[PDB]
Scaffold this active site. Structure first.
Site, PDB file in Angstrom:
ATOM      1  N   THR B  16       0.893  -1.183   0.000  1.00 50.56           N
ATOM      2  CA  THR B  16       0.000   0.000   0.000  1.00 50.56           C
ATOM      3  C   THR B  16       0.921   1.220   0.000  1.00 50.56           C
ATOM      4  O   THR B  16       2.110   1.124   0.496  1.00 50.56           O
ATOM      5  CB  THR B  16      -0.994   0.042   1.168  1.00 50.56           C
ATOM      6  OG1 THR B  16      -0.240  -0.120   2.367  1.00 50.56           O
ATOM      7  CG2 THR B  16      -2.094  -1.002   1.094  1.00 50.56           C
ATOM      8  N   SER B  47       8.687  -3.494  -7.179  1.00 50.57           N
ATOM      9  CA  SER B  47       8.768  -3.185  -8.619  1.00 50.57           C
ATOM     10  C   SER B  47      10.161  -3.442  -9.094  1.00 50.57           C
ATOM     11  O   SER B  47      10.338  -3.584 -10.341  1.00 50.57           O
ATOM     12  CB  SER B  47       8.303  -1.756  -8.885  1.00 50.57           C
ATOM     13  OG  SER B  47       9.283  -0.792  -8.498  1.00 50.57           O
ATOM     14  N   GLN B  48      11.155  -3.656  -8.203  1.00 48.16           N
ATOM     15  CA  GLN B  48      12.460  -4.102  -8.753  1.00 48.16           C
ATOM     16  C   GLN B  48      12.331  -5.522  -9.365  1.00 48.16           C
ATOM     17  O   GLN B  48      13.197  -5.864 -10.161  1.00 48.16           O
ATOM     18  CB  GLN B  48      13.477  -4.017  -7.616  1.00 48.16           C
ATOM     19  CG  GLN B  48      13.215  -5.087  -6.561  1.00 48.16           C
ATOM     20  CD  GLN B  48      12.391  -4.634  -5.395  1.00 48.16           C
ATOM     21  OE1 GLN B  48      11.373  -3.982  -5.484  1.00 48.16           O
ATOM     22  NE2 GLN B  48      12.805  -5.065  -4.229  1.00 48.16           N
ATOM     23  N   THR B  78       8.334   2.553  -7.277  1.00 50.83           N
ATOM     24  CA  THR B  78       8.907   3.710  -8.051  1.00 50.83           C
ATOM     25  C   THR B  78      10.032   3.200  -8.947  1.00 50.83           C
ATOM     26  O   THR B  78      10.237   3.762  -9.961  1.00 50.83           O
ATOM     27  CB  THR B  78       9.301   4.801  -7.051  1.00 50.83           C
ATOM     28  OG1 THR B  78      10.197   4.224  -6.101  1.00 50.83           O
ATOM     29  CG2 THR B  78       8.126   5.477  -6.420  1.00 50.83           C
ATOM     30  N   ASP B  79      10.772   2.129  -8.595  1.00 53.46           N
ATOM     31  CA  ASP B  79      12.012   1.705  -9.249  1.00 53.46           C
ATOM     32  C   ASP B  79      11.793   1.478 -10.728  1.00 53.46           C
ATOM     33  O   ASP B  79      12.708   1.801 -11.507  1.00 53.46           O
ATOM     34  CB  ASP B  79      12.530   0.438  -8.568  1.00 53.46           C
ATOM     35  CG  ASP B  79      12.936   0.687  -7.130  1.00 53.46           C
ATOM     36  OD1 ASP B  79      13.057   1.840  -6.700  1.00 53.46           O
ATOM     37  OD2 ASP B  79      13.185  -0.351  -6.391  1.00 53.46           O
TER      38      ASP B  79
END
Lengths: 315, 315, 315, 315
Positions: B16, B47-48, B78-79
């Protein structure tokens, strides 16, 4: 009192940036007004072909020839100028200014930037105030430290920027107003001594991105590489398959530094990668290519991760 | 006239960003004032670890569920948010706004950015003026196109920037003043149709730097990769050993795109690499990770370099 | 050894930035983990109403109360924080850290930035490494010198930037990696002593632009102003009618500093304005509002232009 | 088919930027390869002396001579080029490209930027793709819209930037890749018609800062000025004494626009200034000098604040 000018040595690594190396003073006649210039061609490569042998050659030549001159200007291609500048920042023991300079437009193009960059590089090398600041890059009217300096744009004459800590000074009408100096230890304050080396430890760089294959990393391992630098995502994160290979390499004698593909900002400790746990080293503000430079030299002195981190915390 | 609110769908890919997906409206109560929010967890990865399967899943879910909702907000790490945003930019055929959003600070930290980013992402998805602009990223009060958007800093809440062409609009008090839109073809104007794919062409990225080993590239070749993206130096130049391997791969059925490790600016045609001569493709302003996205999709349609360049000139 | 925490003093100039001044520790409970905080309301204004009296009050309070505390955090509005920070940079003789902090979002808004900025300001004030660096501003994870720091964007939480020389350090997980310090003389190394003043010399700012009226300048003259700062065009040029009025004022006892409306870069000597000839002073990298601060203090010591230029070359 | 070249008209406002106006083609011989150039000296001023009369002259000359040529390049000083470019953006009714160009280094200096800027300005004016984008500025390889373009640095050749919305396109090897166009109405889509004017409404700019005197503002009032632009602090706030004078002026027939001294970002509605209540107008991303341009032209059509705000929301 004969009003005498500094002796400045130009070391060329490639083609000319104004317009052969003996001719630079006729390419830029205003040079004769600020220095006595001697030119030597050391190599003649494009800087995308830059390599460990040229770095050893430059560091030994400057170290050997320090007494013979008041300061050095190195003409270098822009593509890897930020790598050579950091290598020389860590390995030069001469306490006279070494300034690197290049050109983003060909010497024969309209508004070629080479000539004035060269003038400003000589001004910088001549300025007693430039001493004790490490190895410098001079581009677009600006004096930049060799550690933070990087190429930010593919074509812009203003591409060179110290993107994390800013420039040391600006250059107007042949004078510099310095307002900063690098805190990280450089030049004579490092233990990196390359005088007796003819090779450097094998250090390679792998890129992270969605779906990244573990194969590049595995090829560097299978090759015995002394270290690997990860161009991480975000705050030096790694794609699960790359992380698996690097975690194995780190526990079996490969030095692993986490850097970032992200063009500003530190790869920190205490984020989503437990470095203590994996035997990894965080690169801080060192981008992958810079992190490689420091890891190669850290490996001339130690294979211990905890000692490499200390080196990445001090240089 | 009942004053009714848009239906907005939140698709979550991870943890979250405010504070589970059904609970987001209590995490950010002001949401109920601007939309009717439905949440669905699609995946739960960092997200990596982002990959081709999640991209296919998101594009098909949005394409399938387009009629059911007024617009979509995707919560993403964000990555790699800049990679997913471009993939969706090229593959989404829904003509309703798709907005991606993330947080640079944990939801439980002081001054967590997640909550307001989420508010602004919903505002953006709800705004009829957001339509026809492609797939968007909303971060730090700013609406960004999926093509140019990138992570510029490792830790800064203001890290997301369209570094070559600027943002589309700024967000103040729940309203957007749009002043730009992307000219490159997106969404329904691309031929990229992934509705019937369960894999993507194999595309990998290699890094250039002084002394770069040809081994990563050779591993991708030996693996049969459909394409390779070069993270070049400067204006997409390559280290002589990498160039040799890629030049061979290009003449033997591997698609090769020259991008740049340099964080702004185009990898142009007509510089120091004769692309026609080598069968190479110039990435323009696409950075390596973005260039990979477009090469993978270009390969779903054509293996011809000259046709891939045209695709890199239009999308 | 009782593990004891620094004593940090918060001086408030306005409304709260987290959420009264005695209550800040409950607004941000993590403070109690890094310091012993005492709060005092000194004034309660909006910083657009900032003035000479508040500057005198803050400099005397810090100078008087230096022995009583380990360091100071000042809560201030963002609009004029860059002016107060420079005034305190030149006038504070305490050798303990003074850090200024503000918030770009209201304390009651989603993702309010106040709380974490305040945490980081206290970390900065507590860090023995922060000493001897002048008066600081801490905003968005970054430690900024009071001289170069400025507000670059109207609304962005990342608005505060040292736009000419970069930040001193970044703040991660409550630690700072400092890599720079300001070279210009500050704090105890300036001759500016305001301990016995209850007013400052009258210094006003006029703006240049096409068709600029000479009337604002003439009103400051007619008012007897001790100095005028020109917000010049480009490299501190002036619109012909403004230049005429200022050239007259400079030869009749008004101190005139040429600054620039241009948001980065020095107003230099040796460009299109012969400063020697007009009795003018070049502001260097000082923007108009900052240039005013230094001219006011230069006027507490000297009316001589050549001595004011030397002051603008050293502080 | 004779392969014929566009007819490009150079209008000079000052000294030469390459090296008289008839001679520009010998200063830059590559021009003859991309256009048929005619030069005319319209005025010969330094752009710090730029004024309403020169703006009227240029708008009428371009409007009158539109049929006679394929496009226009205007040579202008850098200090106020961003003001003239916006005035022409709002007042030019010719539907052929108008491009403004300048030089940050003297034509006789090392690495003078004038020559290549001029080449690129002609390329831009010649490119059928440049049409319908408004009035442009071409500097440092970049095509910039006249509305957002501004001078960001005092001396840098890369000073011109569209700091809020980015550039329209980049220029490589005489070709432009356009990826944006300005959304705000320009040229033939504005109601601003200056064909029959020989003066403009009187609009002046006042600066905000700590302790700001109300005297400049009062002088503009006492002078009958039609409008005043406030160079506010932060999000267009005003120092209490300036606000008092402007609040009085607004209720007694003076048009008042709140802009910001802050170099990026909108002066928004709905912040700390109730604009409805004071009869004020918010400038949005228009910086003071640009806001003045639009207020002067808004005053040729209306004195009503609510109608001026609508104009500031559309142009």
């Amino acid at each position: 009192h004969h009003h005498h000018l500094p002796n400045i040595t130009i070391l060329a690594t490639g083609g000319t940036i104004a317009g052969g190396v003996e001719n630079l003073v006729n390419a830029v006649p205003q040079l004769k007004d600020i220095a006595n210039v001697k030119g030597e061609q050391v190599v003649n490569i494009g800087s995308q072909d830059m390599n460990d042998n040229v770095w050893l050659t430059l560091a030994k030549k400057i170290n050997t020839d320090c007494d013979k001159t008041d300061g050095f200007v190195i003409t270098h291609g822009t593509d890897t100028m930020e790598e050579t500048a950091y290598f020389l920042d860590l390995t030069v023991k001469c306490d006279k200014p070494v300034v690197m300079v290049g050109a983003m437009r060909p010497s024969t193009s309209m508004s070629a930037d080479g000539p004035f960059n060269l003038y400003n590089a000589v001004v910088t090398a001549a300025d007693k105030a430039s001493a004790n600041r490490g190895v410098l890059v001079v581009m677009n009217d600006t004096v930049l430290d060799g550690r933070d300096v990087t190429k930010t744009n593919t074509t812009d004459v203003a591409t060179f920027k110290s993107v994390n800590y800013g420039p040391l000074g600006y250059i107007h009408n042949g004078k510099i107003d310095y307002q900063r100096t690098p805190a990280r230890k450089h030049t004579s304050d490092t233990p990196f001594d390359v005088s007796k080396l003819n090779e450097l430890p094998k250090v390679g760089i792998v890129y992270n991105y969605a779906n990244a294959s573990d194969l590049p990393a595995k090829a560097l391992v299978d090759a015995g590489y002394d270290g690997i630098v990860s161009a991480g995502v975000g705050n030096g994160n790694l794609y699960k398959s790359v992380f698996d290979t690097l975690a194995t390499a780190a526990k079996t004698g490969t030095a692993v530094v986490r850097s970032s593909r992200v063009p500003t900002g530190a790869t920190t400790q205490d984020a989503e990668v437990d470095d203590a746990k994996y035997g990894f080293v965080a690169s801080g503000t060192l981008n992958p290519q810079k992190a490689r430079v420091l890891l190669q030299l850290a490996l001339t002195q130690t294979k211990d991760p905890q000692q490499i981190q200390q080196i990445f915390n001090q240089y």
